[PDB]
Automatic annotation (TrEMBL), chain A:
Protein species of origin: Komagataella phaffii (strain GS115 / ATCC 20864) (Yeast)
GO BP annotations, alphabetical order: termination of RNA polymerase I transcription; termination of RNA polymerase III transcription; transcription elongation by RNA polymerase I; transcription elongation by RNA polymerase II; transcription initiation at RNA polymerase I promoter; transcription initiation at RNA polymerase II promoter; transcription initiation at RNA polymerase III promoter; tRNA transcription by RNA polymerase III
Main location class: nucleus
Keywords: Nucleus, Transcription
Residue span(s) of domain RNA polymerase subunit H/Rpb5 C-terminal: 34-106
Keyword Transmembrane (UniProt): no
Record keyword Isomerase present: no
Protein name: DNA-directed RNA polymerases I, II, and III subunit RPABC1
Location(s) in or outside the cell: Nucleus
Domain of life: Eukaryota
From TrEMBL, chain G:
GO biological process, one term: transcription elongation by RNA polymerase II
Domain RNA polymerase Rpb4/RPC9 core: 20-143
Similarity comment text for this entry: Belongs to the eukaryotic RPB4 RNA polymerase subunit family.
Origin species: Komagataella phaffii (strain GS115 / ATCC 20864) (Yeast)
Protein name per UniProt: RNA polymerase II subunit B32
UniProtKB/TrEMBL annotation, chain H:
Entire protein: shown range: 1351 to 1457 of 1743
Naturally occurring in which organism (per UniProt): Komagataella phaffii (strain GS115 / ATCC 20864) (Yeast)
Protein purpose: DNA-dependent RNA polymerase catalyzes the transcription of DNA into RNA using the four ribonucleoside triphosphates as substrates.
Designated name of the protein: DNA-directed RNA polymerase subunit
UniProt record similarity statement: Belongs to the RNA polymerase beta' chain family.
Domain of life of the native organism: Eukaryota
Localization: Nucleus
Automatic annotation (TrEMBL), chain I:
Pfam family, one: SHS2_Rpb7-N
Cross-referenced InterPro entries: NA-bd_OB-fold, RNA_pol_Rpb7-like_N_sf, Rpb7-like, Rpb7-like_N, S1_domain
Name of this chain's protein: DNA-directed RNA polymerase subunit
Broad class of the protein's primary localization: nucleus
S1 motif domain sequence ranges: 84-164
CDD domains: RNAP_II_Rpb7_N, S1_RNAPII_Rpb7
Physiological role: DNA-dependent RNA polymerase which catalyzes the transcription of DNA into RNA using the four ribonucleoside triphosphates as substrates.
Family: Belongs to the eukaryotic RPB7/RPC8 RNA polymerase subunit family.
Signal peptide: none
GO BP: nuclear-transcribed mRNA catabolic process; positive regulation of nuclear-transcribed mRNA poly(A) tail shortening; positive regulation of translational initiation; regulation of septum digestion after cytokinesis; transcription elongation by RNA polymerase II; transcription initiation at RNA polymerase II promoter
Species assigned in the record: Komagataella phaffii (strain GS115 / ATCC 20864) (Yeast)
PROSITE patterns: S1
Subcellular location per the Swiss-Prot or TrEMBL entry: Nucleus
Length: 107, 45, 271, 547, 84, 99, 143, 107, 171
């Protein structure tokens, strides 16, 4: 997790997938002054083991594609370092029942 | 006429004859080819 | 844009691709038709006046149920084992009370299925209850029964856990309203309900509830499609009778990258 | 009756007709350019229109599989064009396509070797695949016949002829590019087809294609599919009067532009005066499918008329798709002038006698209602409690207003009778713009006199109607289940509570509202004499006078 | 495929749409001169008779409720409580 | 003539879930028509001589696998048009793409 | 194109699906063995239907010229007789389904012969198949 | 998004119930980003072809549909209307079958 | 060569025949529409195993009418010729242009241009034959041929084939 102040070189970063299995992320400075999760509208998220995942899918009979998505370069997706294939459980307030449980997979 | 419909339709109609004041109106009518034109300007006074 | 959206036999809202847009229509699975504006008592007022209403202490001359309500008020008076179950309840309600203020606005009026306010006004004269002769309920009758009730307010039915969690979850708010009107203090001091009455109300709530649930098939998208546009179809570009009204809504639905009047509201810091 | 099994579509597969197939399927060579006249003799020459295809006038012709007009679909024919033409609507992709494939050879411009491509090449999605690809292959323009392998740039084959690939741009209906040493301007001929044909089968698959249902190449037409009469019908002023479709012109025009073309490719061919006539064929074929394009030339039919292009006939509202398919005019329907009645139950709807005597309902004969039916049948179609058509099992219809056996007839269980709507019959009533769930509701029929739909007052605001001239459409159900469906889901009582605002949508309007206020005031007193005539007026009265 | 009589999840009540079509079919069945199993107590409209046949839960029919994935759930008209 | 049942009128009915009734409008009370598709090349080729049973459908040469369907004549034309534009609308009575 | 290069239609891959939704190995059905499966069903059919082949046809046959022929031919060419003699072969043989059947329903003496009428093997099965090949003609029941 | 549409409705005194706006809002958000209710949005997803074909680019919508050879389920409301079959819409969102087993208990 | 594929078929039934013992009728009706059929797709349908206990499952009721739609899922014994495939049958007829063979319910023909040169048709010989420097083929005789091509037709599949290589022909 390198924290580039302004920007890394195009010649540079072309050596990130050159050290697999491991993976590296890049975050601009001026974009991390305030944690976005702490925000009112931003609900608390949570990851899900490939057991709890292979359960969720089974418990509702869902085919992955049938699941609400989230962009890979999404501020929260990055923040929690998601990956193409990972799920995220969202728990927010609901003026009809109190609490709803939504999930978004990271494509 | 010809393969030239690139004219303007509306001009010349079938004069109303429902009532006298109808017919009258029709002759004294003006058109205006196409949110601002539709407005009722002052100049219309 | 919503045509192919329709509730499914498990209560999921999806489309012509099966993509789940909502796991439980409206986040509760209730059909708007069967819903009315109720007022969740619990939420408003001070903890002091709250306590002076729902707090019960069988070990005290002034904060106990007057013997004009039960038929065994004195032979029940002082039981330590019961006053603990009376805490469990009250300890719950406080978890609730603080969890509901966790709607920071305070507005206690909300749309909620099963009009408990009326259903009791109905009980009032079906069995004709006098504001004179004491009721006849064990403290267990009521509390356990309302616990047994919550258990039957089933939306989802699943065997496993994941479902049963969703169950409790997308219900909760309701349950609190239920308790709010089924607290020991009120059910006995205000409307002396008999054993019969209680057994009726429950049975009806249960039945009513199950009917207030959405019916699978309901072409929801087409429904919501109109439901939204209609009170928009009835307006004037005139903002009579910042960029607002008709064009703004348009602007939004178009997901415009450059609205005329942008603006942004920021609140100060704590202090 | 047809022995073949009845089924429903569970899947629709799109692709493109392969010329060899279109040829195959075609049952008419369609070579001649005339109309019919077998040399002035009136018929239909085996050349153009009807050379065995369908027919009109209850005339068996239809590739002899008779059936005549109704039962008989149109019948396709073809026409071998002399030379390949560009498909008016594909010119966009075709160009971005060439930017990605090499000419003079015909193979990819990026193999598994390059990484960023692999990813894209693995993206399983016929559209998002073809997206990422072009953004890459649009730069490199040299079909290297020798290139440094994935080792040492010392040693160096794949496809050959490293000819520089041109940068194409759109100028009217023609694609041109330059080849570079030093560029080359040339007007790219329709070479392209050949290159596609050559493209490897395994390459097709690399892009979002399928060697079986749609290969890139089939985007250019060789043998043109000629559509039959039912597609481009003639409208005669009875019979012995012309009446020809828009398309029934631009076909012979195409034909002629084909003929003349060929008659320039077998005679003194002025090589730079031919292109001027190919572009012409190219044009008439542009016309035929679309005649509202960029390079103006509207191509108007003698009079100024625009000439509906197939895609015009489809343009939303009125045009086929949204006009005839997504919503069509239907039978068993009626419309007239509305006027409210304060003495009709909420869910009723007073219907004008005239109308009741027109709309029917197929009700099967049963030993429970035979008695009632036997009265209704004798009355005839001009008497109110009557009927107007009797249909025996043997799919044929007796017209109840003429037939010599009018009062005779004894029914037979299992037959169906179409009766006039009667009191307490569910029917679909509506008012457009239909923007509500409540804009259509089932009402009970109540036959009344006078030419107008009599609806209740309180149900005015849902449709949002008034009586200042407004008209209303009425539709009439047809099945035994349909009815149930009308009363179990569209009944007025179920609609009383609007789901959008969890509140009703029908209250007490005008007079009734205005007055109930007065009538309510403490100052409002009523004496016995009136207090009697009022309880009587209440149908639901418990029959007990309150103290 | 399948799905045992056990682990059945859908509603035990008959959705108006289910009910609506059931009354539908059986109605035309009767109008196809089929046999009715009750006492038309002066009743004469098939759909009423069926509505009665319903209120008395005596309509031999089974509803296979399908789930988005492709599996199904069978329930009888006898089973499904018909309060309303 | 006859009154149009345009989009907005469709919509409403769909909200009501009046599936069948709608299917009964667009077909029984208007268009309707019995077309014969081919079990192989999903097209409207079949030479159905309703007498000598003869069905056929050359170019794909079949006479055995053919299906019957009930669709609005208005639509049949839409397809012929689409065909006449060189696009191929295959109709399958069985799913083939799987998943 | 369709050829005996073992590139049969898409409808007959070694892994087909059971009516109950399961996976099952193809079904090779050599002569004689076929004559039994048929006869067995045709018998237990004509059993509850009452609760030597020309007759049995115009009763359990469509009334189906095809069966008489399919019964004669399958009895004038069957290369075996006992449900055991066929079992042995299966208890043995279990190569791709088509072969294990063809080898059983087609006469063969030499390997040179089999390898000639089935030119696709050669390296698609070790030589000691030859042993077996003898072992076949070796258990090629006597007359 | 919800808050914003609501504030356009509530400034006119009119009230609409959450679930509705929610549903819309969700469909726009769910597909990964912000699909606008316009030719450059919903009408451009992996949805059915006949469906999207019934709005704006009607013909062109088909060209690039037969081009990449799309396969349409016919599970979408539109398709069936165009075909004339009962769509899986309430009344038809299920089957009615005679159970022979009980059809013996039925005599 | 014979297989046992688990196929299925759909049959519609008018409401009249909607009694209590239907499964029985369905089963027996299946056979009358299957046993004896022939499709180029699946070949020659000859026998349905385990009749008695066929599985029918619930059938659905068509909305329009009252009829029921049944998806009968069975299993059967079939036999279909493939190209390059090798089998042997009895010669049925025999002229100067070749001979016709009968494989079960089938009839395959061998062209005089697809046989080995050295086998000419014998003229006035009883029974009518074809002569080789040593061999002789006639009706009775069993011949092993190779099916070059197969043509699927109505309710019968005919074909063509040859005996020109070596180790092929009569036996
Ligand atoms: Zn015909
Ligand atoms: Zn090249
Ligand atoms: Zn075909």
């Amino acid at each position: 997790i390198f924290i580039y102040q302004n920007n890394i070189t195009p010649s540079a970063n072309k050596m990130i997938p050159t050290v697999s299995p491991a993976i590296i992320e890049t975050f601009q400075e001026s974009d991390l002054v305030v944690n976005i999760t702490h925000h009112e509208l931003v609900p608390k998220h949570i990851r899900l083991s490939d057991g709890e995942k292979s359960q969720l899918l089974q418990r509702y009979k869902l085919k992955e594609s049938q699941l609400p998505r989230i962009q890979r370069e999404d501020p929260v997706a990055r923040y929690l370092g998601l990956k193409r294939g990972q799920v995220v459980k969202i728990i927010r307030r609901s003026e009809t029942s109190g609490r709803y449980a939504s999930y978004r997979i990271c494509l | 006429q010809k393969k030239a419909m690139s004219s303007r339709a509306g001009v010349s109609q079938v004069l109303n004859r429902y009532t006298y004041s109808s017919t009258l109106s029709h002759l004294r009518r003006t058109n205006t080819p196409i949110a601002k034109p539709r407005q009722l300007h002052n100049t219309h006074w | 844009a919503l045509e192919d959206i329709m509730v499914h036999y498990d209560g999921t809202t999806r489309n012509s691709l099966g993509d789940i847009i909502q796991f439980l229509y409206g986040e509760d699975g209730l059909d708007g038709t069967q819903v009315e504006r109720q007022t969740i008592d619990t939420i408003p007022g001070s903890d002091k006046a709250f306590h002076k209403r729902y707090y019960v202490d069988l070990m005290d001359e002034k904060n106990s149920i007057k013997p004009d309500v039960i038929e065994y008020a004195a032979d029940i008076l002082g039981d330590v084992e019961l006053q603990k179950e009376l805490n469990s309840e009250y300890e719950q309600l406080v978890s609730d009370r603080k969890f509901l203020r966790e709607f920071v606005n305070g507005d206690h009026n909300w749309p909620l299925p099963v009009n408990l306010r009326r259903i009791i006004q109905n009980a009032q004269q079906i069995f004709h209850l006098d504001r004179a002769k004491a009721s006849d309920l064990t403290i267990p009758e009521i509390i356990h029964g309302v616990r047994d009730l919550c258990k039957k307010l089933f939306v989802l039915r699943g065997e496993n856990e994941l479902i049963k969690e969703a169950q409790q979850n997308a219900t909760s708010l309701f349950q609190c309203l239920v308790r709010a009107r089924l607290a020991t203090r009120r059910i006995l001091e205000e409307f002396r309900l008999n054993r019969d009455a209680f057994e009726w109300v429950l049975g009806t709530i249960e039945a009513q509830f199950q009917r207030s649930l959405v019916h699978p098939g309901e072409m929801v998208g087409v429904i919501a499609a109109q439901s939204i546009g209609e009170p928009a179809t009835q307006m004037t570009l005139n903002t009579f009778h910042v960029t607002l009204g008709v064009p703004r809504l348009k602007e939004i639905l178009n997901v415009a990258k450059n609205i005329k009047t942008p603006a942004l509201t920021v609140y100060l810091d704590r202090e | 009756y047809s022995s073949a099994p009845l089924r429903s579509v569970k899947e629709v597969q799109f692709g493109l007709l392969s010329p060899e197939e279109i040829r195959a399927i075609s049952v008419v060579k369609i070579e001649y350019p005339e109309i019919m006249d077998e040399s002035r003799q009136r018929p239909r020459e085996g050349g153009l229109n009807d050379p065995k295809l369908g027919s009109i006038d209850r005339n068996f012709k239809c590739q002899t599989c008779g059936e005549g007009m109704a039962e008989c679909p149109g019948h396709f024919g073809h026409m071998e064009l002399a030379k390949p033409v560009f498909h008016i609507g594909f010119i966009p992709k075709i160009k971005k396509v060439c930017e990605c494939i090499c000419m003079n050879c015909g193979k990819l411009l990026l193999d598994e070797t390059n990484p960023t491509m692999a990813q894209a090449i693995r993206i399983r999605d016929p559209k998002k695949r073809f997206n990422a690809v072009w953004q890459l292959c649009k730069t490199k323009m040299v079909c290297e016949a020798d290139a440094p392998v994935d080792e040492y740039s010392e040693q160096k084959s794949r496809g050959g002829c490293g000819n520089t690939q041109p940068v194409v741009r759109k100028d009217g209906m023609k694609l041109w590019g330059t080849w570079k040493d030093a560029q080359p301007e040339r007007k790219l001929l329709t070479e392209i087809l050949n290159v596609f044909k050559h493209i490897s089968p395994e390459d097709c698959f690399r892009l979002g294609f399928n060697e079986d249902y749609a290969r890139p190449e089939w985007m250019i037409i060789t043998v043109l599919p000629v559509p039959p009469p039912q597609v481009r019908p003639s409208i005669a002023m009875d019979e012995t009067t012309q009446g020809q479709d828009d398309l029934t012109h631009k076909l012979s025009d195409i034909l002629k532009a084909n003929i003349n073309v060929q008659k320039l490719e077998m005679d003194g061919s002025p090589q730079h005066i031919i292109n001027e006539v190919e572009q012409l064929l190219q044009f008439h074929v542009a016309t035929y499918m679309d005649n509202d394009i960029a390079g103006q030339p509207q191509a108007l039919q003698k009079s100024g008329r625009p000439v509906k292009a197939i895609r015009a006939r489809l343009k939303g509202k009125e045009g086929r798709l949204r006009g005839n398919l997504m919503g069509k005019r239907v039978d068993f329907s009626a419309r007239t002038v509305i006027s409210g009645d304060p003495n009709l139950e909420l869910d009723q709807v007073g219907v004008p006698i005239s109308i009741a005597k027109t709309l029917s309902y197929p009700e099967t004969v049963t030993q429970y209602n035979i008695h009632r039916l036997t009265e209704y049948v004798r009355n005839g179609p001009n008497e109110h409690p009557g009927a107007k058509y009797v249909i025996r099992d043997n799919g044929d219809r007796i017209d109840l207003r003429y037939h010599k056996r009018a009062g005779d007839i004894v029914l037979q269980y299992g037959w169906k009778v179409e009766r006039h709507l009667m009191d307490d019959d569910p029917v679909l009533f509506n008012r457009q713009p239909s923007l509500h769930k409540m804009s259509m509701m089932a009402h009970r029929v109540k036959v009344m006199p006078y030419s107008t739909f009599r609806l209740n007052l309180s149900v005015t605001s849902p449709y949002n109607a008034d009586f200042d001239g407004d008209e209303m459409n009425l539709h009439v159900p047809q099945s035994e289940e349909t009815r149930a469906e009308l009363s179990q889901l569209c009944a007025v009582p179920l609609q009383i509570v609007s789901p959008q605002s969890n509140k009703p949508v029908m209250g007490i309007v005008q007079d009734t509202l205005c007055g109930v206020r007065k009538m309510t005031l403490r100052d409002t007193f009523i004496e016995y004499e009136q207090v009697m005539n009022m309880l009587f007026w209440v149908p639901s009265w418990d029959g007990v006078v309150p103290q | 495929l399948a799905i045992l009589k056990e682990e059945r999840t859908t509603t035990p009540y008959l959705t108006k749409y289910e009910r609506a079509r059931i009354l539908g079919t059986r109605a035309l069945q009767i109008s196809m001169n089929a046999p009715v199993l009750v006492d038309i107590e002066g009743e004469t409209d098939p759909l009423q008779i069926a509505m009665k046949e319903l209120s008395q839960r005596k309509i031999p029919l089974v509803i296979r409720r399908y789930l988005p994935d492709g599996s199904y759930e069978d329930w009888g008209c006898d089973e499904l409580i018909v309060d309303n | 003539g006859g009154l149009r049942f345009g989009e907005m009128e469709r919509d409403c009915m769909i909200a009501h879930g009046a599936a069948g009734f709608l299917k009964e409008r667009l077909m029984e009370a208007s268009d309707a028509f019995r077309v014969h598709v081919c079990g192989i090349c999903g097209l409207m080729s079949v030479i159905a001589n309703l007498k000598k049973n003869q069905f056929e459908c050359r170019s794909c040469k079949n006479k055995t696998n053919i299906y019957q369907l009930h669709i609005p004549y208005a639509a049949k034309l839409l397809f012929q048009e689409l065909m006449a534009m060189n696009i191929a609308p295959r109709l399958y009575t069985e799913r083939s793409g799987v998943s | 194109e369709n050829a005996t290069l073992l590139r049969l239609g898409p409808e007959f891959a070694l892994k087909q699906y059971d009516h109950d939704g399961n996976e099952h190995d193809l079904i090779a059905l050599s002569l004689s063995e076929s004559r039994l499966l048929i006869r067995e069903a045709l018998k237990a059919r004509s059993r509850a239907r009452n609760g030597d082949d020309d007759e049995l046809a115009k009763v359990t046959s469509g009334a189906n010229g095809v069966v008489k022929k399919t019964l004669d031919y399958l009895n004038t060419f069957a290369r075996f007789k006992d449900e055991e003699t066929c079992t042995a072969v299966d208890q043995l043989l279990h190569l791709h389904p088509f072969e294990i059947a063809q080898l059983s329903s087609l006469g063969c003496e030499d390997v040179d012969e089999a390898i000639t009428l089935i030119p696709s093997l050669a390296a698609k099965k070790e030589v000691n198949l030859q042993r077996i090949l003898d072992e076949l003609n070796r258990l090629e029941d006597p007359y | 998004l919800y808050k914003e549409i609501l504030n356009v409705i509530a400034f006119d005194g009119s009230y609409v119930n959450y679930r509705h706006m929610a549903l819309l809002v969700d469909v726009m958000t769910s597909r990964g980003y912000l699909m606008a209710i316009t030719r450059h949005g919903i009408n451009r997803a992996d949805t059915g072809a006949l469906m999207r074909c019934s709005f704006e680019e009607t013909v062109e919508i088909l060209f690039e549909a037969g081009a990449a050879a799309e396969l349409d389920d016919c599970r979408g409301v539109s398709e069936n209307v165009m075909l004339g079959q009962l769509a899986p819409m309430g009344t038809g969102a299920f089957d009615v079958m005679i159970d022979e087993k009980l059809l013996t208990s039925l005599p | 060569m014979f297989f046992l594929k688990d196929l299925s078929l759909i049959l519609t039934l008018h409401p009249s025949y909607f009694g209590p013992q239907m499964n029985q009728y369905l089963r027996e009706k299946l056979l009358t529409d299957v046993e004896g059929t022939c499709t180029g797709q699946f070949g020659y349908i000859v026998t349905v195993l385990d009749g008695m206990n066929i599985d029918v499952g619930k059938g659905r009721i068509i909305p329009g009418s009252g009829s029921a739609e049944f998806e009968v899922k069975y299993r059967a014994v079939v036999w279909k010729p493939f190209k390059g495939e090798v089998v042997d049958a009895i010669v049925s007829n025999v002229s100067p242009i070749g001979f016709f063979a009968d494989v079960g319910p089938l009839n395959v023909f061998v062209s005089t241009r697809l046989i080995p040169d050295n086998l000419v048709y014998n003229p006035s010989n009883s029974p009518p034959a074809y002569m080789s420097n040593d061999e002789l083929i006639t009706k009775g005789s069993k011949v092993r041929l190779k099916v070059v091509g197969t043509r699927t037709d109505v309710n019968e599949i005919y074909a063509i084939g040859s005996i020109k290589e070596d180790f092929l022909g009569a036996i």
